[PDB]
Amino acid sequence: SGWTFGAGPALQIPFPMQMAYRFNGIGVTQNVLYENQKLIANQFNSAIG
Amino acid sequence: PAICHDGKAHFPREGVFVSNGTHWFVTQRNFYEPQIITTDNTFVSGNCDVVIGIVNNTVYDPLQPELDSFKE
Amino acid sequence: VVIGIVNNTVYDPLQPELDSFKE
Ligand SMILES: *[C@@H]1O[C@H](CO)[C@@H](O[C@@H]2O[C@H](CO)[C@@H](O)[C@H](O)[C@H]2NC(C)=O)[C@H](O)[C@H]1NC(C)=O
Ligand SMILES: *[C@@H]1O[C@H](CO)[C@@H](O[C@@H]2O[C@H](CO)[C@@H](O)[C@H](O)[C@H]2NC(C)=O)[C@H](O)[C@H]1NC(C)=O
Numbered sequence: 001s002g003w004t005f006g007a008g009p010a011l012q013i014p015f016p017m018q019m020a021y022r023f024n025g026i027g028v029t030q031n032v033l034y035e036n037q038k039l040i041a042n043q044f045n046s047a048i049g
Numbered sequence: 050p051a052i053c054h055d056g057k058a059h060f061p062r063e064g065v066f067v068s069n070g071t072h073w074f075v076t077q078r079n080f081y082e083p084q085i086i087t088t089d090n091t092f093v094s095g096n097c098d099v100v101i102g103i104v105n106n107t108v109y110d111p112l113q114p115e116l117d118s119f120k121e
Numbered sequence: 122v123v124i125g126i127v128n129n130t131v132y133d134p135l136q137p138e139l140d141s142f143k144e
């Protein structure tokens with residue numbers, strides 16, 4: 001549910017759009033994630049491993 | 050996540066795309082207020098074959114009818 | 122609906138440039 005569950009009840013949202021919104025929150029245009037979704041996923045998988 | 054019009058991806062300027070079942074709309078995040086998808090609510094970036102989950106629709110340009118009807 | 126609205130006019134930039142040229 002992203003961060004919306006901290007206000008009231010949980011609100012559905014797909015994870016890639018939540019990540020795009022987090023990018024938008026730090027001054028990076030949201031097209032960057034959608035153009036580089038696989039690379040970011042692989043980087044996160046390598047980092048957490 | 051995006052809407053394709055002429056082979057070019059369209060992303061919402063501020064908001065999330067939404068559909069009630071038949072037509073598509075753009076609205077803000079914390080309140081339901083659908084609006085017609087025009088060329089002022091979206092910005093073009095890239096092409097139509099890089100994004101996963103894109104859909105098809107037509108973005109209404111207010112310039113086209115209002116300028117072509119009068120210019121005749 | 123709004124309480125306190127006042128009457129005025131909004132200037133459209135496209136209309137003068139259009140009707141002055143397209144005429
Ligand atoms: C989804 O929204 C669209 C847009 O308003 C609805 O289409 C309208 O339907 C009414 C009822 O038949 C018509 O009078 C309007 O002319 C339609 N709008 C347009 C732009 O043609 C549609 O009915 C909605 N669907 C549901 C299931 O609510
Ligand atoms: C959005 O519309 C385009 C334009 O028709 C679709 O592209 C067509 O895709 C089919 C199936 O792959 C091809 O047979 C056609 O030749 C394509 N059109 C052209 C002009 O080449 C596209 O598939 C549509 N999007 C979706 C998700 O169906």
Ligand SMILES: *[C@@H]1O[C@H](CO)[C@@H](O[C@@H]2O[C@H](CO)[C@@H](O)[C@H](O)[C@H]2NC(C)=O)[C@H](O)[C@H]1NC(C)=O
Nearest residue numbers: 122123124125126127128129130131132133136
């Ligand atoms: C802003 O303009 C509108 C119309 O130009 C005004 O509405 C008119 O008000 C008079 C006052 O009695 C009525 O006789 C007319 O019938 C109204 N016209 C319409 C179309 O409703 C409105 O009053 C103006 N605003 C202010 C604050 O004066």
